[PDB]
Symmetry: D2
Subunit: 116 residues, 4 copies
């Protein structure tokens, strides 16, 4: 698994469950092309998004649908979603973990990159 | 200050405001595309004021894009993100003033919104 | 403002400054214990100014304690932390002004320091 | 494992390795009593700090020696250490994960609490 996502809830102190995540890749014509999608599990993690074979060099955008997550909890959040845009594998294949901590009016994201 | 929208950027590596950071603001148009709205560069205090006025700032979806990549390269540091973006809906129902704050690190960034009405 | 030390607290759940938050500042004494130095409550803008002066603020180790627990209980929310603490060394070598900022959530808090000299 | 710690480095985008962690418990006389200590591993995690049997109700302090971590990297950090103080198991036994993201002039910490 070359691309994984981990989301946590800072209001409840638990993993953010069933959060929709859409992954896009910058196409040749400079437009966002659908690449993969999923929902986080019980532990707030999302795996199996792609393979080393399909995860080629490029600029990717990871969109986390925070808005839907909060509303389903009766909270009216500030952000429409959280976006993480980055260039991947431009110096050979690597493994990426995109982590996100969510709050109604705030979120922070970090990336952990390891060489296989 | 009657500025409806403000931006504040900080540097978590050097513990100082993030200066000369390019900031571009966009608004969602009917045809579902992003059209330029305002832009500028953070000052010596890492702030960016006077991006718009109450009259022009109507309800709708806005995107605030911060060129963090160029900020880090200028310091000789390899960043992870292409840029940082904050997408939100501005409603007159809620308070009046919007402050978008961002704390930057090479592989991480956090952002918060302060919505207060005077 | 010549205030050498400033504190800013924000609420990430309601997107507003954290008001009436108790803040206690301590300094490390020779016998390795913490002795009261200054204290106060954040204002309507979540800020706390005039905690000390240049004369009294000498080099040494300081601890800034924020009573976050009472803040959350007042909102009817069960917090995780007893309080938030920021322990740092103040040196004349480095810049002059210190701003300690904290973003609060029930199960999480982040803090950053802005050190700038005018 | 009822108490685990996870630390990440936001400057290098990797787990924070060999970070010293000391855990204290508030004693009857209102003083901090040593409870456990360790260093994070290759993955930036610290496990095996205590057992469900020894981890009784009380106020605990988790101290992460960030200062030493940064200096060993040639960086002069702002904080002496990072402190997480909390009341644990006051409503029955729970599992705690204390997570921390570190930067030279900043750090954020969150807690994940799950019921066994
Ligand atoms: O997230 C962290 O790790 C710590 C942190 C704390 C605060 I509080 C922040 O927000 C502001 C907002 C205003 I308005 C300020 O003037 C200042 I100084 C900081 C940010 I971004 C980041
Ligand atoms: O930002 C804060 O206030 C605190 C914080 C600390 C960490 I470290 C985080 O990242 C991870 C990454 C992995 I992989 C985990 O398994 C877990 I648990 C948390 C997040 I999001 C938020």
């Amino acid at each position: 698994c070359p691309l994984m996502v981990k989301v946590l809830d800072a209001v409840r102190g638990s993993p953010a469950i069933n959060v929709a995540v859409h992954v896009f890749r910058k196409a040749a014509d400079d437009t966002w092309e659908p690449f993969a999608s999923g929902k986080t599990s019980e532990s707030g993690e999302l795996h199996g998004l792609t393979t080393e074979e399909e995860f080629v060099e490029g600029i990717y955008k990871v969109e986390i649908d925070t808005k839907s997550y909060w509303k389903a909890l009766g909270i009216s959040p500030f952000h429409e979603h959280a976006e993480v845009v980055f260039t991947a594998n431009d110096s050979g294949p690597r493994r990426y973990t995109i982590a996100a901590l969510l709050s109604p009016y705030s979120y922070s994201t970090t990336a952990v990159v390891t060489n296989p």
